[PDB]
Design a binder for this molecule. Structure first.
Ligand SMILES: *C(=O)[C@H](CS)NC(=O)CC[C@H](N)C(=O)O
Ligand SMILES: [Ca+2]
Ligand SMILES: [Cl-]
Length: 200
């Protein structure tokens, strides 16, 4: 990992969870944590984690293999090649009748991101998924999607539950770096990246 990130797979990373007071969502999300089934499915993995964490009925559970079994929003063949945009992520979640608030970085700011997300992370029954450019947080890749689990107030870092579990552990990222990474233009959408709030 680049030195600006603190891996959850370290004593320091564990301590950031232990000293966080905005960490409720870590529990149900970790309980549903999955590895993206292929290199393009980060958004699908993120969605099914959140849907299962919310208790959404599809035992009747969501799976990356059953998610598209919704197709009218975006075809699985398109997602397999290109992933999904922030707006497509919103619509895919909404296709199962769940409430979504999509926040493009261009329409908000770092202070409101931090405040609203930190408050959300204290609450069960709702969740946050981020869409960000990996290069901007010191990681390898283009645009990625994963849920957020916790916020450490002392260090101003958010815990990303990275669904690329074969490649990276969950990481604690500085708010400033995560903001910079969301405040990037996705060439597919020609819109900024950002974050989504998900609730019943
Ligand atoms: C994760 O597996 C995929 C890899 S392409 N990423 C996304 O679905 C986000 C894609 C979107 N266009 C972006 O660039 O942020
Ligand atoms: Ca929450
Ligand atoms: Cl799965």
């Amino acid at each position: 990992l680049s030195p600006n990130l603190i891996g959850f797979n370290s004593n320091e990373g564990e301590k950031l969870l232990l000293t966080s007071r905005s960490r409720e969502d870590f529990f149900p999300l970790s309980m549903q944590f999955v590895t993206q089934v292929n290199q393009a499915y980060c958004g699908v993995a993120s969605i099914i984690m959140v849907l299962n964490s919310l208790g959404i009925n599809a035992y009747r559970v969501f799976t990356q293999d059953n998610f598209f079994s919704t197709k009218a929003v975006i075809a699985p063949e398109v997602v397999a090649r290109q992933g999904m945009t922030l707006d497509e992520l919103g619509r895919l979640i909404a296709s199962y009748g769940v409430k979504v608030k999509v926040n493009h970085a261009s329409d908000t700011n770092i202070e409101d991101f931090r405040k609203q997300v930190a408050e959300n992370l204290k609450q069960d029954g709702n969740f946050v998924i981020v869409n960000y450019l990996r290069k901007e947080i010191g990681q390898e890749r283009g645009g990625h999607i994963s849920p957020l689990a916790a916020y450490n107030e002392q260090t101003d870092r958010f815990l990303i539950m990275d669904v690329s579990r074969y490649k990276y552990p969950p990481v604690w990222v500085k708010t400033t770096d995560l903001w910079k990474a969301m405040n990037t233009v996705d060439s597919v959408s020609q819109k900024t990246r950002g974050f989504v709030f998900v609730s019943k």
